[PDB]
Amino acid sequence: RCGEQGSGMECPNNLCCSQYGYCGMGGDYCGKGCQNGACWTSKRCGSQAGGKTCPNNHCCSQYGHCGFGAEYCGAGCQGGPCRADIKCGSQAGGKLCPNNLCCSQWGYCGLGSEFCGEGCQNGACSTDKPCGKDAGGRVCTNNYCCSKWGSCGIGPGYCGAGCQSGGCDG
């Protein structure tokens, strides 16, 4: 299942999540009731939608609609994989990258070893620095949960029993 019926799961290759939480293509999926993917009626995002982000890594246009191509990812792009470089980190007042993108040592948002590897400042860093009581009490970035084992992440093993800090369950 996808969307609401499956913890916000998204379909592969821009397939549409129907109102019943099934992946497909055509009116019964992409038409009325479409939850995510290549929905015929584009989702709202950005300033026009209270800062809401686009699903499926779609770009948020200057008009607050989700999609792909120059009109969405080009000039005035508000979110998603915008064509413009996106600044983050201590170079930009500690600004986080949206959608868990990694902030590189240089203060740019992205994914891949150049971003998530050595010097990664926030997001889905691969550096896996220890947190919690055995790490001076370092809290994770992005409000990620610090597990009882002193590692940062999201999931029952991080946010559940023994969660030391972050988005711990409650």
Ligand X SMILES: CC(=O)N[C@H]1[C@@H](OC(=O)NCCCOCCOCCOCCCNC(=O)O[C@H]2O[C@H](CO)[C@@H](O)[C@H](O)[C@H]2NC(C)=O)O[C@H](CO)[C@@H](O)[C@@H]1O
- Residues 49-78 touching its own copies, rule: CB under 8 A, are 53, 55-59, 61, 65-73
- Judged by beta carbon distances under 5 to 8 A according to partner kind, the member of its own copies, ligand X, none in contact with residue 96 is none
How many residues are there in the chain? 170
Check whether 68 is labelled as a binding-site residue. yes
**Three-class SS state of 44:** strand
Task: Give me 155's structure tokens.
Answer: 């999931």
Cβ atoms of 37 and 26 within 8 Å: the answer is: no
* Residue pair 145/158 in contact by the 8 Å Cβ criterion: yes
Q: Are 59 and 72 in contact (CB under 8 A)?
A: yes
| Binds 144: which of ligand X, its own copies, none (CB < 5-8 Å by kind) | its own copies
164 binds its own copies (CB under 8 A): no
Q: Which is nearer to ligand X, 4 or 71 (CB)?
A: 71
| Interface pick for ligand X out of 88, 158, 164, 165 (rule CB under 6 A) | 158
- Which partner, ligand X, its own copies, none, binds residue 73 by CB below 5 to 8 Å per kind? its own copies
Cα separation of the two ends of the chain: 26
| Residues 16 and 30 sit within 8 Å (Cβ to Cβ) | yes
Query: CA-CA distance, 103 to 150, in Å (whole number)?
Result: 22
Which residues are near ligand X by CB under 6 A?
18, 20, 22, 26-29, 31, 42, 61, 63, 65, 67, 69-72, 85, 104, 106, 108, 112-115, 128, 147, 149, 151, 153, 155-158
Q: Which residues are annotated as a binding site for substrate?
A: 9-11, 61-72, 113-114
